[PDB]
């Protein structure tokens, strides 16, 4: 029902196939570093923007008009899921996300919706995905996404960002049964949501475990890993059963150096890396089956266009040509210069071709 | 001129000697989790507390009255150094540290003092150290400390904590010459300060590189490592030349998994670990010469006293008995229960003895 994909380099790399160059995209490529993003966002409030399919489609396309990126990622936010579960959220400009009434005791779980109804609440995201897939007209693949269960749990309990996740970790140690209950509710909401994203037109999916780094290995293996595994297994299952093709799935565990070995066995085609893990060491950890994605320090884009090209050259030398999709090690920051993002994109394309012939 | 040390287990472990049990201390053992700490702090404002030798001595001793910890660490704060360099600081209760006028351009370096005069500005810390060494009367060794150059740089440029260190990293990429100038000024202030701490009575020194994790390996090796190395080399040199004994030096690089190999060659007797690095993997990285310190997830202390003992048992099994000092993976949090800190201390003592005979 959709236009035929023209440039599929990103998908071929994700599945582990040889490609003629290394495909590249950037986390937060639709973001505040773009003046045009600020302009179209100035029209609605944040979660209102997320609910207008035309606005989401527009913000998704904007970076592709500037740069020859090898994938688009739908504009949305990981917090749409806990919102759909019945939590009230804000993105008051300059402050970041906030739940003024976070989950703090086991009894608070009673306020959440049955996770089986969440996908219906997120119909607007599916509308945006279908629209954007049609408007892209096959230029590049479209990535859908969501937050991983533990990371969503941290926002719901902490009520926003935290440097320690002390309240969410206190749940894991003091309320392990209620923690597993919440993580299961999240898993059960995420599966039908991700499946719906693919039904609507997503050609790949990325799960953001942005708060992995706070756990360390014992708690990660108990509370984050099982659910990351269950998401991949159940999404693939549901898609096959609906007669659709599974899409490549990416797991990005920020600050998750300690989990890479387990992550490479978790049922994802691609493991995304932050900038703190040396590419050669990541390759040793994950082995030679999975694709790696990343991992340039996003702050490297503050350097000159010349310096960016040399950092990219180095990065590409370390990863080598096979089983690799270039990206930053985290999302672009709001004060970054679009021309330097352009420099990063062009450097990956130029140097990866030089590396092959 | 000081009382003879009675319990030197911590020092013997630090130098790599076999001991009859594993010594233990906790970062922030003088901290807000103690009601008595809040009480004596309620008397002065924060940096005024830091300037009263009797108040510092009291806060240092308080945890030792509760628990048989194997070392004391002087109460102070890493921010006394940039304050002594001429920056104005606040610790407005509930808000954390703040410099209302952070360093933002190269010209701002002109406001700092010559680093050679910093030690004289920090005479109050040396007074506190001498007092505390006398009052401890040889019970356990006294640890002195300071922030590492990069970590101090982040506070001076950011003006407080940050989840990204984007402004400080922008300096490293866009102003590398001015960054090296600032890091050298910091190094040159830290050396005479640390030497003065030992002259005043410190029996060990810990350098806190709390913001290591933001760098990743390339920037860490360029901007943090050289100065961490220079601190150790110059402190040891100055002490030998004054006819004093060097003390064991600990480098703690929080979120510094990627730097452990380099850190084990940096001139420190002890490498301190956060809770995200598996003890066996840390041992592989650092080799068999240095002592490891750490690394229990501080949030594990939210668990039951029984659970804490089993986590400690596991941790001790992984580190093994040799070249190991037990501690948390970061400082105690203000909402922690002193009885659970007591449980941690007792578990290390009990299980490490069981592990030996």
From Swiss-Prot, chains A, B:
Q: What is its main location?
A: cytoplasm
Q: Where does coproporphyrinogen III bind?
A: 28, 30, 32, 77, 155, 210, 330
User: Does the entry feature the keyword Nucleotide-binding, yes or no?
Assistant: no
- Look up what happens after changing residue 184 to P: In FPCT; insoluble protein
Gene Ontology cellular component annotations, sorted alphabetically: cytosol; nucleoplasm
Checking HAMAP family in the record gives: URO_D
Cited function: Catalyzes the sequential decarboxylation of the four acetate side chains of uroporphyrinogen to form coproporphyrinogen and participates in the fifth step in the heme biosynthetic pathway. Isomer I or isomer III of uroporphyrinogen may serve as substrate, but only coproporphyrinogen III can ultimately be converted to heme. In vitro also decarboxylates pentacarboxylate porphyrinogen I.
What is the protein name given in its UniProt record? Uroporphyrinogen decarboxylase
């Amino acid at each position: 029902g959709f236009p035929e994909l023209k440039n599929d380099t990103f998908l071929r790399a994700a599945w582990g196939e040889e490609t003629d160059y290394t495909p590249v995209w950037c986390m937060r490529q639709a973001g505040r570093y773009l003046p045009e993003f600020r302009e179209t966002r100035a029209a609605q409030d944040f979660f209102s923007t997320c609910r207008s399919p035309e606005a989401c489609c527009e913000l998704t396309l904007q970076p592709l008009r500037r740069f020859p990126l090898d994938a688009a990622i739908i504009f949305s936010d990981i917090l749409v899921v806990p919102q759909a579960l019945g939590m009230e959220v804000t993105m008051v400009p300059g402050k970041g996300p906030s739940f003024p009434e976070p989950l703090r005791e086991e009894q608070d779980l009673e306020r959440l919706r049955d996770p089986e109804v969440v996908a219906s609440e997120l119909g607007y995201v599916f509308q945006a995905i279908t629209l954007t897939r049609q408007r892209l007209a096959g230029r590049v693949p479209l990535i859908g996404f969501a937050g991983a269960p533990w990371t969503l749990m941290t926002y719901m309990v902490e009520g926003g960002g935290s440097s320690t996740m002390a309240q969410a970790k206190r749940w894991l140690y003091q309320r392990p049964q209620a923690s597993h209950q919440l993580l299961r509710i999240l898993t059960d909401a995420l599966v039908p949501y991700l499946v719906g994203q693919v039904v609507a037109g997503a050609q790949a999916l990325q799960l953001f475990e942005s708060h992995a780094g706070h756990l360390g290995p014992q708690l990660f293996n108990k509370f984050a890993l099982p659910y990351i595994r269950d998401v991949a297994k159940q999404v693939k299952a549901r898609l096959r059963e609906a007669g659709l093709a599974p899409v490549p799935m990416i797991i990005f565990a920020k600050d998750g150096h300690f989990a890479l070995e387990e992550l490479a066995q978790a049922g994802y085609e691609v493991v995304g890396l932050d900038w703190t893990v040396a590419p050669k060491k990541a390759r040793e950890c994950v082995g030679n089956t999975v694709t790696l994605q990343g991992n340039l320090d996003p702050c490297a884009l503050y350097a000159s266009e010349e310096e960016i090209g040399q950092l990219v050259k180095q990065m590409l030398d370390d990863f080598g040509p096979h089983r690799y999709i270039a990206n930053l090690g985290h999302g672009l920051y709001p004060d970054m210069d679009p021309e330097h993002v352009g420099a990063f994109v062009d450097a990956v394309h130029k140097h990866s071709r030089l590396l092959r012939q």
